[PDB]
Symmetry: C4
Subunit: 225 residues, 4 copies
Amino acid sequence: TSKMQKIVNHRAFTFTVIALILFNALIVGIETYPRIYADHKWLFYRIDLVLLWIFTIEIAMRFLASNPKSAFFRSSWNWFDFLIVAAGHIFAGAQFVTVLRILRVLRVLRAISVVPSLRRLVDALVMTIPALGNILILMSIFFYIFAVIGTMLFQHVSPEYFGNLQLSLLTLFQVVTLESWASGVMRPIFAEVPWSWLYFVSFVLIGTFIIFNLFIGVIVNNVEK
Amino acid sequence: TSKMQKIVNHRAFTFTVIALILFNALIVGIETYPRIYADHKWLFYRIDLVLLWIFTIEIAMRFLASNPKSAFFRSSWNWFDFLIVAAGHIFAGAQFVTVLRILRVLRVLRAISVVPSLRRLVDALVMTIPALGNILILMSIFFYIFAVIGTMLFQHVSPEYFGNLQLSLLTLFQVVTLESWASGVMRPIFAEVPWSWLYFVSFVLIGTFIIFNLFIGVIVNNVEK
Amino acid sequence: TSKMQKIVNHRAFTFTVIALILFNALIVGIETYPRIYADHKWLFYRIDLVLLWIFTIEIAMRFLASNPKSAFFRSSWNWFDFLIVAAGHIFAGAQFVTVLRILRVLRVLRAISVVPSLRRLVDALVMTIPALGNILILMSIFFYIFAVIGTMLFQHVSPEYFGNLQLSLLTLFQVVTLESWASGVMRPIFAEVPWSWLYFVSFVLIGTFIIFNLFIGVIVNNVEK
Amino acid sequence: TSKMQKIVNHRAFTFTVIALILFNALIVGIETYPRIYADHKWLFYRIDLVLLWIFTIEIAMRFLASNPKSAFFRSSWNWFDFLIVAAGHIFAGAQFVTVLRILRVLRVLRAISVVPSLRRLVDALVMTIPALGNILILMSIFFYIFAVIGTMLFQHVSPEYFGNLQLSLLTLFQVVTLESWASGVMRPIFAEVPWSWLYFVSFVLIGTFIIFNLFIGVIVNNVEK
Ligand SMILES: CCCCCCCC/C=C/CCCCCCCC(=O)O[C@@H](COC(=O)CCCCCCCCCCCCCCC)COP(=O)([O-])OCC[N+](C)(C)C
Ligand SMILES: CCCCCCCC/C=C/CCCCCCCC(=O)O[C@@H](COC(=O)CCCCCCCCCCCCCCC)COP(=O)([O-])OCC[N+](C)(C)C
Ligand SMILES: CCCCCCCC/C=C/CCCCCCCC(=O)O[C@@H](COC(=O)CCCCCCCCCCCCCCC)COP(=O)([O-])OCC[N+](C)(C)C
Ligand SMILES: CCCCCCCC/C=C/CCCCCCCC(=O)O[C@@H](COC(=O)CCCCCCCCCCCCCCC)COP(=O)([O-])OCC[N+](C)(C)C
Ligand SMILES: CCCCCCCC/C=C\CCCCCCCC(=O)O[C@@H](COC(=O)CCCCCCCCCCCCCCC)COP(=O)([O-])OCC[N+](C)(C)C
Ligand SMILES: CCCCCCCC/C=C\CCCCCCCC(=O)O[C@@H](COC(=O)CCCCCCCCCCCCCCC)COP(=O)([O-])OCC[N+](C)(C)C
Ligand SMILES: CCCCCCCC/C=C\CCCCCCCC(=O)O[C@@H](COC(=O)CCCCCCCCCCCCCCC)COP(=O)([O-])OCC[N+](C)(C)C
Ligand SMILES: CCCCCCCC/C=C\CCCCCCCC(=O)O[C@@H](COC(=O)CCCCCCCCCCCCCCC)COP(=O)([O-])OCC[N+](C)(C)C
């Protein structure tokens, strides 16, 4: 006999949870200002515990609502919720007492999993990755090649941008979004070594040609089916 | 008996209205220069009243031309016209005597509602919003998350850009159009805190990936039907 | 009897003309350097006249080759050729003796009309304009509105960018290609008047939303037929 | 009798080669840092020879594995491999002893030819060029025209950007990716000669209109078939 999971299904529960999420966003936004936060700090304390208490129980409900002896964690969107809320308790007295603030902020992000028409949208929007999941390998290969060619040439011409392999990856990420690829990056270097342009004029091309076929390949297969 | 709304329909009337609109644009453009305006101020006065008088009557015509006891205001494009022209009279002697100038400028904008092939174009171009009216919610959620994560980290590292929640929204709007996201925004901060790049390199990605599916989603459904 | 326009049709003639065009490009490029030009000026003179003489006759041929008593000028691509080459002679001794240089440069541009697969490409690529020939009117209206709203507000806050109606059109053209719309244009102004952002944050949106439907509208009708 | 090319076909061989490629990438990346390289230089030497020895033999295998008396070099992707690896030996004692380093870096690039689903992807991604292989000619013609018009006007107004035909090509490449086309390039010049804007406002248009039809033309034919 099990009179627990019979009418355990609810409808207006989602409105409760979304109101809680929006109230948490409104709470944590206010925490940003310094003068308001110090003065109202006493009031806020009881609230974080209160909000945390409100969440945990409402995910334990879902835990003991849909066949606990089943794929509750084999599914997605539930492992995620549990990870966030449980980290909520685990980092409550962590030596790093401040990551709790960032995670409290990140809490609201579950508002895409508790409402329909968002869960479905992000589900499709992420399942589309393995479609273009091949050109990414190409834009990694042609990315590392230049990231490691540049750093051995322009290492003593401009240590700021091309200082080292991991610091020269950031620059070749700046130059592929076409952001000051001629005011800060190229021109000062090009003023020193004369044949350097063949490295930027051949990266803003062979690099914008893949970001282009990314678009085309995700626009063809996403239309055909 | 009603011999009013029988031949009240007109054809060349639209040419009168469009000539008036273009003349109003030409009038208000000249108002910009200071030397010309002060000298010709006496001449201009009689004109604003004259143009205002010309409009009001020609919208009252439409008011008493197509079944006044019907959906004259339940429709759109008429509520808009009436709002603009009536604000014309309401702000004529407002304590704010200068908003009348901006609204006089904005008057010409009705040139999209008085001519065909523009009304239809803007009608479709705005009705397409509820199609992508879902990804906007996602680009608001993932927007607020970073807008409130950044402001609590980089609040005492660069008060100019990330000074406060409402002043840090503008910056994260600058960095999503890829405008000086490495010359002004990132590099000075990144020179202070070392692991900050994971916040910009993970916003120019997870933020240009939604502006991308915006494009794709509005290019698929706008082709299929 | 007319034994002129019988075998007047030619095949290898196009190779002669394209070789002449490429040689003219190679000639005029060299003219750019100053040291080379002064020294070789004597040699160059005989060449411009020689090239000009070579052209004129080869367009007079076409004039008297395909039914001169027909639509030789009602067609396009011939009126263009004749205009360029005839300007060649007309500006030979013009009071402006230097526009002849720019027009000599522009001469090579006819290389798109004398070779196939380019004439056809540019023909289609320009005939596509009346398709989107409607959104352009909208991007002119919403362009003038802001171009004349901005100049009356920010006329004594930054005369460089928003100095006058014709000088403020250039700025609102800069801000619609998303080029330093927050480093040079907005931020200095926004530091003076506080509520100014509502003018740039509402132009980089309602202005990139039309440049977007430009793309979509020219990608739908250019696929459907 | 030929008992050589009977069971010469292999399967796990590709895993050997890809492990070698990844190990070469990991080896050459470390070479970038200076302190690590000098100290570990003795260890590295034996490795370059070892890796080089490992490659050469494994391409000679393929040479004598698939009908050497056939189109081994008439094919592609094999001429490329052989060119790279053979340059490996040819530049081993070159007067330029340092290009060997860059070529050692470039060695890893063959990781797109030794694994499937990459060879096919790059094959299609390059075979698509002759489709748009016509608009490129147009974007070369309209490119040279402005590249040689600008250099004769703005040669004594700003020698930095428009110094000469080959140095003014770089600038008109900067201005077509819309990168500081109003902060560095235009505004300083435009402050000197007044009617110069008609050269940049008519290049950022007639130049972004071809990069646009590039997109459209490669999105239509790449969908239709
Ligand atoms: C199918 C085939 C795929 C091919 C993919 C190829 C991948 C192959 C992967 C190759 C691995 C890369 C080799 C780097 C190893 C360096 C180790 C090191 O010395 O650390 C140095 C510190 O500095 C760092 O550790 C920087 C951390 C690495 C930054 C990024 C490395 C990988 C990124 C690659 C981008 C990948 C994708 C990018 C685009 C998304 C230590 O030196 P030091 O600082 O002087 O401190 C003292 C040194 N000491 C310890 C001796 C005392
Ligand atoms: C489906 C779920 C959707 C989720 C959406 C989440 C939305 C949840 C919404 C949450 C609301 C946000 C909380 C902020 C409230 C602050 C109040 C405040 O203190 O004002 C301060 C002034 O400064 C301001 O008032 C700034 C105005 C707000 C800027 C933008 C806020 C909302 C933007 C969010 C972006 C939304 C989208 C953005 C992208 C389009 C007052 O402090 P002070 O200045 O020091 O002056 C003295 C203080 N004193 C009065 C005590 C004396
Ligand atoms: C369907 C409906 C369509 C609606 C379209 C609306 C179009 C309506 C068109 C309206 C016309 C615009 C009105 C401006 C007239 C100013 C005349 C003037 O005073 O000149 C001044 C000089 O300065 C100039 O002349 C600047 C030249 C004009 C710049 C651009 C104007 C039009 C651009 C609009 C952009 C259009 C599209 C833009 C996007 C492509 C003279 O003053 P001054 O310099 O002090 O010199 C002394 C003065 N003095 C002579 C008295 C001694
Ligand atoms: C279907 C039709 C197609 C039409 C296409 C048209 C193509 C027609 C091609 C025309 C050729 C161009 C003419 C330039 C020749 C200059 C020679 C010269 O004087 O060198 C100078 C050096 O400086 C250089 O040599 C610069 C090198 C050339 C840069 C790019 C030239 C071609 C680029 C074009 C872009 C093409 C595409 C661009 C977009 C991809 C020498 O002078 P100096 O430096 O003072 O040194 C002393 C001089 N001295 C030796 C006398 C002592
Ligand atoms: C999700 C985000 C990454 C995405 C995956 C990337 C793979 C992993 C890549 C890198 C991971 C390894 C880096 C570890 C850094 C340790 C050292 C360090 O502190 O960093 C240093 C450098 O900072 C960087 O190197 C940033 C690395 C950028 C990698 C991706 C670039 C864009 C990828 C585009 C991909 C698009 C194509 C599709 C592929 C995605 C900063 O500190 P520092 O070393 O002390 O430097 C001096 C500090 N000081 C100056 C303040 C004094
Ligand atoms: C239609 C336009 C907005 C669109 C809706 C946005 C929602 C509502 C958002 C904000 C509305 C609430 C802000 C109220 C401002 C009051 C205080 C103030 O003066 O502002 C201050 C800051 O200025 C800002 O914060 C600009 C806000 C940007 C919001 C949108 C950013 C891009 C959205 C992209 C969306 C794309 C994705 C799809 C979603 C659209 C300026 O004055 P101050 O505070 O005194 O600062 C110091 C002044 N001083 C330095 C000069 C001394
Ligand atoms: C083909 C190109 C134009 C295209 C048609 C544009 C329509 C006609 C528009 C303008 C034509 C009328 C301007 C006449 C200028 C006379 C005065 C003058 O010298 O100009 C002045 C300003 O320079 C400008 O105003 C540039 C005008 C830009 C117009 C188009 C902007 C982008 C359109 C985007 C369209 C995209 C959407 C679709 C619509 C296309 C410069 O000289 P000055 O006044 O002495 O200023 C001080 C000089 N000093 C500082 C050096 C000391
Ligand atoms: C694969 C990359 C090229 C692509 C083909 C390009 C064709 C061939 C084009 C040029 C080749 C000929 C140039 C030879 C240079 C010799 C002189 C020289 O040193 O260069 C000089 C200039 O540097 C340049 O001129 C760069 C040339 C850019 C050409 C392409 C621009 C973008 C094309 C976009 C195409 C997109 C549309 C589709 C078409 C592709 C640098 O040295 P310098 O002269 O001493 O100058 C002073 C040096 N100092 C200041 C440090 C003191």
